[PDB]
Design a protein around this nucleic acid. Structure first.
Ligand SMILES: [Mg+2]
Length: 1026
DNA sequence: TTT
């Protein structure tokens, strides 16, 4: 996996659409919508933890997400509540699955614990979680200054409806409001198809979808918070890429109605497969589904009155036409996997396949009555889903009452289909629980119905099969497998609940009501005390307010869908976070250039964008004339502000200082580089690279200080200079950006912290006293002697052999050293796991790589010798190679030893041994003078304001360097001082930003003397003490 | 809940 198949697909068909970015590349947002069931799953059962632990970790998760994304206006976190029957059927399927998969995996314990099905609403678990969560919001917002300008909304298991859909509802409600901002930048947590489709159908302009790369789980690889990156999808581009795909639907010289088109595309996306209906065998993404629905639609389009999905409502005639068209696809799928006048033969065999299918797999006779009710229920289904999205739930009771899908060929007279579902109401937690849980998890229910789950007398015993069969329509994985069970009739079920209900325990009786969502807002006025809750410590005073809002204060009742295209919004202007391909006249074509967006090269086609040859003559003097020294926007459509510092040609090149000659070789090389990037990753094709432009990316606003006189404010550019083809330069666009300081004193208030950049105490803590130069008091502190520790390390660094040397000492082939020292999978792992060549990793002091050659330390060698001594035949195998019990034996022998306990790290990073760490720690132990001075303003770091380019060291950071923290860094408060014990580079795997492509950021495993002991920290938040 |  790594990422959903849908995400993967549309992400490769439109290369510019998605990226893997780090904390700082994520665009600014007003609203973050966080969906919790995923998280709760990650934290509860990835081995043992108690509730306290779990909650603590969930809380953490949230904290780090909010910390990294910094939603400026709203933070809506939404836990799945009691959902409509349509979903509940599937929820139930997944429960039964997990229960049985659970028993099966516990069976390995027979060969030789936290029930997860409690992640559903109504369970004592989820309730306790709800509590702890409100408590958490209250603490965080009440204490943390960063959660105080935000508005926060929680929607718990209390409030009914899928998290993702409660989010949706709040969004539509939002659009409804009068003085609502059409430009609000929405960020939604998640990558699966449903959330893409969802955000895409809100018809919101600045909407991003994102999820972290690695669950926070790989913390056994020591990753700083700031090091974590996100996969993100830009809906704004998705739109433009569809506008590109259906260009053939244009009949005149003018844009198609994108609202109209998006709607229909939402429809296709729903056809590919959704939760609330069985999937059509003939439509899987890997199976080229989207392209097929595209072809079908395009080729059918001139015939429909207009849209199949009009503003969330279906056009049964047009629908009909479409499905009719899909018949081809379906029949072709049949013709393909059949074996696992010709046509006529095909059709007879296919009709026979139908009959036999209805009979065998549908357990129903093929009466035309059957086709009838199948068509009925299917069309009903579709409309139901569209309502779910465009207008909110329109039926809590309704559900597709079959386990399989109709035959497209057998869908005629759709138009005659009557659609009528009724709202009804969401089930009470216990009802839904009994509807969803399998016999296995009876415990999660109150005692009152345990009997109902497990006593074969039970009226509902049918719905609780000890054994349930599973059909897999050519779907490979057990999870894709259909789960053949009954469908609960609400009647009989509530009938079999009547007696028990009264007898429920008091607290059980109380926890069985639906509930509201809560709105937290930081208050200056003290709101009183809060009790503690495992694991949140108690609070003497709250500084926030919690306020109940019910499901119906968010309700929008109208004939049309508010999921319309707000016209107040500005799509002419550029917003920094959000790319558009609009500002450049370009042609386009769908080609087969094998673009590389993820790990490996795409196997299918993509859309190549081709900017039209610009009007500016492609000469040096001409390009310079226009753009030299000017402020432009490069990268496209992922635009950035930048200033042109040089223009170059294979022959010559212009600086502010005049024209000179240029290295042809180096130029042609740069050009190759650019070409490769754009085509292979960006699916972009410029006319030519005859003339390059070299820019500096905008790097923050800078405040200059003018003598004793005044405060100046200017633009700040970058350190590094990157090259961009002159053909992709876009100039003079207007942008929507957006609190200046006033007095010098306003900048430097009394008692605020100041850091020194002047030689006498480069890196000294300080405090401003009087803005007159500036009056300041510096707190001088001693610095530990590290020469000793350095010395220790140098000798250890000496302890290293070469791959060959090591081959000789162990008397083994080079190959066998290769397999032995890496990871070798047997089917289970049996490699000492010291090096990870493909990954580009190395294990601590054991392995290390320099001249593209490997070197192993002594611990490594004694280890490898050990392995050899003990397990010879295995080695013999490694050497001569290109009851299942011995494996487990050595797999464990290996997993046990301590090199596993030692951190693995990326190659090119310098580390240190625990002994040296000991010496250092001892020195700091051993170590345990305010000086007033007048200091020019530009040599003072204001902790969270000053741009890091003013304090970046002219020399790369080194080990044992003495560092102090300026910029705030998650756990570590500013001011904390320490010494470097690690230096770790980091490069983006596949940057879509040409500027980032080979940029390496530096993190430092730092030993702060104070406990707060050790943390990786970006070089940006550091000064070195001179 | 995801794959
Ligand atoms: Mg969901």
């Amino acid at each position: 996996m790594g990422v959903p198949k849908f995400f993967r697909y549309i992400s490769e068909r439109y290369p510019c659409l998605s990226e893997l970015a780090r904390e700082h590349c994520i665009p600014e947002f007003d609203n973050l919508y966080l969906d919790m069931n995923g998280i709760v799953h990650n934290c509860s059962h990835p081995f043992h933890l108690e509730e306290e632990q779990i909650f603590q970790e969930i809380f953490n998760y949230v904290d780090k997400l909010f910390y990294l994304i910094k939603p400026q206006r709203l933070f809506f976190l939404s836990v799945d509540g009691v959902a409509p029957r349509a979903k509940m059927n599937q929820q139930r399927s997944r429960r039964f699955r997990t229960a049985r998969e659970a028993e099966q995996q516990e069976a390995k314990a027979a060969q030789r614990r936290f029930d997860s099905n409690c992640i559903t609403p109504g369970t004592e678990f989820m309730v306790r979680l709800q509590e702890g969560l409100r408590a958490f919001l209250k603490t965080k917002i009440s204490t943390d200054p960063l959660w105080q300008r935000c508005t926060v909304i929680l929607s718990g298991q209390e409030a009914p409806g899928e998290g993702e859909h409660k989010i949706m509802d709040y969004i539509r409600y939002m659009k409804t409001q009068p003085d609502y901002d059409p430009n609000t930048r929405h960020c939604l947590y998640g990558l699966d198809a449903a959330l893409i489709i969802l955000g895409l159908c809100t018809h919101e302009l600045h909407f991003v979808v994102l999820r972290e790369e690695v669950k926070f789980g790989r913390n056994v690889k020591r990753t700083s918070v700031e090091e974590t990156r996100f996969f993100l999808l830009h809906l704004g581009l998705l739109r433009e890429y569809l506008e590109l795909e259906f260009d053939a639907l244009r009949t005149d010289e003018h844009k198609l109605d994108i609202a109209q088109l998006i709607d229909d595309w939402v429809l296709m996306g729903f056809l590919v497969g959704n939760d609330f209906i069985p999937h059509l065998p003939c439509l899987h993404i890997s199976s080229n589904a989207l392209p097929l629905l595209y072809r079908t639609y395009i080729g059918i389009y001139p015939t429909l009155g207009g849209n199949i999905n009009e503003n969330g409502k279906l056009n049964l005639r047009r629908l009909q036409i479409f499905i009719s068209a899909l018949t081809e696809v379906e029949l072709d799928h049949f013709k393909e996997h059949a074996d696992d006048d010709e046509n006529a033969v095909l059709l007879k065999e296919f009709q026979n396949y139908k009959r036999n299918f209805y009979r065998n797999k549908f357990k129903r006779d093929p009466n035309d009555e059957l086709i009838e009710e199948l068509c009925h229920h299917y069309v009903n289904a579709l409309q139901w889903v569209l309502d779910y999205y465009y207008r909110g739930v329109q039926s809590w009771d309704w559900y597709y009452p079959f386990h399989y899908t109709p035959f497209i060929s057998d869908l005629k007279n759709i138009e005659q289909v009557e659609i009528a579902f009724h709202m009804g109401t969401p089930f009470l937690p216990f009802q839904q629980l009994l509807a969803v849980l399998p016999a296995a998890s009876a415990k999660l229910l109150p005692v009152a119905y345990h009997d109902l789950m497990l006593l074969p007398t039970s009226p509902l015993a049918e719905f609780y099969p000890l054994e349930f069969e599973s059909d897999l329509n050519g779907k490979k994985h057990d999870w894709e497998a259909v789960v053949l069970i009954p469908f609960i009739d609400e009647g009989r079920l509530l009938a079999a609940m009547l007696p028990c209900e009264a007898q429920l325990s008091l607290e059980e009786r109380e926890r069985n009501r639906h509930g509201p969502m809560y709105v937290y807002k930081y208050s200056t006025v003290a709101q009183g005390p809060m009790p503690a809750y495992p694991p949140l410590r108690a609070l003497p005073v709250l500084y926030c307010t919690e306020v109940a809002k019910w499901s119906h204060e968010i309700a929008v009742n109208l004939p049309y869908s508010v999921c319309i295209e707000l016209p107040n919004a500005a799509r002419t202007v550029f917003f920094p976070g959000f790319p558009t391909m609009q500002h450049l006249p370009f042609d386009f074509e769908l080609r087969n250039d094998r673009v590389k967006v993820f790990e490996q090269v795409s196997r299918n086609q993509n859309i190549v964008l081709k900017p039209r040859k610009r009007q500016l003559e492609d000469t040096l003097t001409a390009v310079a004339s226009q753009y030299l020294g000017k402020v432009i926007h490069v990268g496209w459509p992922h635009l950035v502000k930048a200033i042109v510092v040089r223009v170059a040609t294979r022959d010559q090149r212009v600086d502010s200082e005049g024209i000179t000659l240029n290295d042809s070789r180096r130029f042609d090389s740069e050009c190759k580089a650019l070409q490769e990037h754009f085509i292979n990753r960006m699916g972009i094709q410029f006319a030519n690279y005859d003339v390059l432009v070299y820019v500096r990316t905008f790097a923050g606003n800078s405040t200059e200080f003018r003598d004793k006189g005044a405060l100046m404010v200017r633009d700040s550019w970058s350190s590094s200079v990157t090259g961009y083809p002159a053909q992709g330069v876009v100039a003079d666009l207007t942008v929507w950006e957006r609190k200046n300081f006033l007095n010098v004193e306003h900048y430097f208030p009394v008692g605020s912290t100041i850091f020194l950049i002047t030689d006498p105490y480069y890196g000294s803590e300080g405090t401003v006293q009087d803005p007159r130069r500036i009056q300041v008091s510096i707190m001088v502190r001693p610095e530990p002697k590290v020469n000793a520790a350095r010395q220790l390390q140098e000798e250890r660094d000496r302890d290293y052999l070469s791959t060959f040397q090591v081959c000789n000492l162990l008397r083994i082939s080079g190959r066998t050293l290769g397999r032995l020292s890496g990871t070798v999978w047997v089917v289970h792992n049996i490699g000492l796991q010291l090096k990870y060549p493909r990954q580009n990793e190395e294990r601590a002091g054991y392995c290390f790589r320099t001249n593209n050659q490997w070197y192993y330390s002594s611990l490594a060698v004694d280890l490898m010798r050990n392995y050899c001594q003990r397990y010879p035949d295995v080695i013999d195998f490694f050497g001569d190679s290109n009851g299942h019990r011995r494996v487990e034996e050595l797999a464990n022998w290996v997993r046990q030893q301590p090199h596993m306990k030692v951190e693995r790290i990326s190659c090119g990073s310098k580390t240190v041994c625990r002994e040296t760490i000991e010496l250092l720690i001892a020195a700091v132990d051993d170590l345990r003078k305010h000086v007033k001075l007048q200091v020019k303003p530009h040599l003072l770091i204001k902790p969270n304001v000053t741009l890091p380019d003013v304090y970046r060291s002219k020399r790369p950071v080194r080990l044992f360097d003495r560092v102090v923290i300026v910029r705030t860094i998650y756990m570590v408060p500013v001011g904390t001082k320490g010494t470097v014990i690690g230096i770790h580079p980091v490069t983006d795997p596949n940057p879509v930003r040409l500027e980032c492509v080979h940029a390496v950021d530096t993190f430092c495993k730092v030993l702060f003397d104070s406990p707060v002991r050790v943390y990786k920290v970006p070089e940006i938040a550091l000064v070195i003490i001179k």
